[PDB]
Structure 1
């Protein structure tokens, strides 16, 4: 009566499992998760990567707290180069990037970068891969697309926790905002979805969901 399974070695992305180590000035673990990066933006010019990058420091000032410090320093340097310390959940490394906030690049905001304050540890894990999408499903109507989209978070009206299925029944009548990364645009976007367990198809979204090493946002072979 022995196991019919054994162990084998496989390649996995470096930004998985237990990270040794972190090397973060300021010593914190939270920072500003870079989500959407607009076209022709200072954030773009600075090479901020959607989903993978975290702004952890500006001009030497560590960003441990969810306040107005980052927004004030940008507002105080509106056309001047600013230095940012960037943490990558992909390379697990820190890099210095120059960025110049501006009102003159024609988009919304001073960075052209949508951010959210959160922790960057196991942030490469909390990803839900959109698989198949039924016709006329809530997922379809909201703009979710099969296989190209990965759900990476939500605008949390109400509060509970973070895993995905644990939101869509609780928003059974109310619209839900989702953070959706796309592997063609390599960018996040806002999707507003109206969950319905009785829409007339699978689940409350009408789409499949994958989680795990088979369902992560892709990474290049080399740094």
Structure 2
């Protein structure tokens, strides 16, 4: 129940991108109020969704607002990849 979802690649102009979610430095640590991430994203299709987001480089938490939209034009409803806990990315 203390699950963390690591934001990976963020497509340009995706719901995720408009919300300001940052590839590989941001982690979704909760909504603003008991549900997991995927059913939340599902159940807020077309509706704004508040999220609490930890960033590793700034080492700090912030509020972010996202509207999932399966019709944004690409894959999914957010247009990002997501990892469980932490995936280790090597900048090359």
Tell me the TM-score range normalised by the shorter chain: 0.7 to 0.9
Q: Distance in 2 between matches of 1:137 and 1:144?
A: 10
Give the Cα–Cα distance (whole angstroms) in 2 for the partners of residues 136 and 154 of structure 1. Answer: 22
Counterpart pick for 1:165 among 38, 46, 51: 38
List per-residue Cα deviations over 1:17-39 (Å, max 9, x = no partner): xxxxxxxxxxxxxxxxxxxxxxx
* Misfit runs of 4+, over 2 Å: none
Partner of 2:48: 175
**Which residue of 2 is the match for residue 69 of structure 1?**
none
Runs of 5+ consecutive residues of structure 2 not aligned to the other structure:
88-92
For the aligned residue pairs, the C-alpha RMSD in angstroms reads 1.5
TM-score scaled by structure 2?
A: 0.87
Answer yes or no: is 1:185 the counterpart of 2:58: yes
Q: 2:12 aligns with which of 119, 123, 135?
A: 135
In 2, Cα distance between equivalents of 1:183 and 1:202: 26
Alpha-carbon distance, 1:202 to partner: 1.9
Superimposed CA distance per residue, residues 32-72 of structure 1 (whole angstroms, 9 cap, x where no aligned partner): xxxxxxxxxxxxxxxxxxxxxxxxxxxxxxxxxxxxxxxxx
Q: State the structure with bigger RCO (CA 8 A, min sep 6), 1 or 2.
A: 2
State the distance in 2 between where 1:162 and 1:208 align: 20
Aligned position for 1:60: none
**Structure 1 regions of 5+ residues with no counterpart?**
1-121, 217-223
Which aligned pairs between 1:9-48 and structure 2 lie closer than 5 A? none
Q: TM-score with structure 1 length normalisation? A: 0.37
- Between Structure 1 and Structure 2, how many residues are aligned? 87
Mapped contact 1:169–1:197 kept (Cα < 8 A): no
Larger gyration radius, structure 1 or structure 2? 1
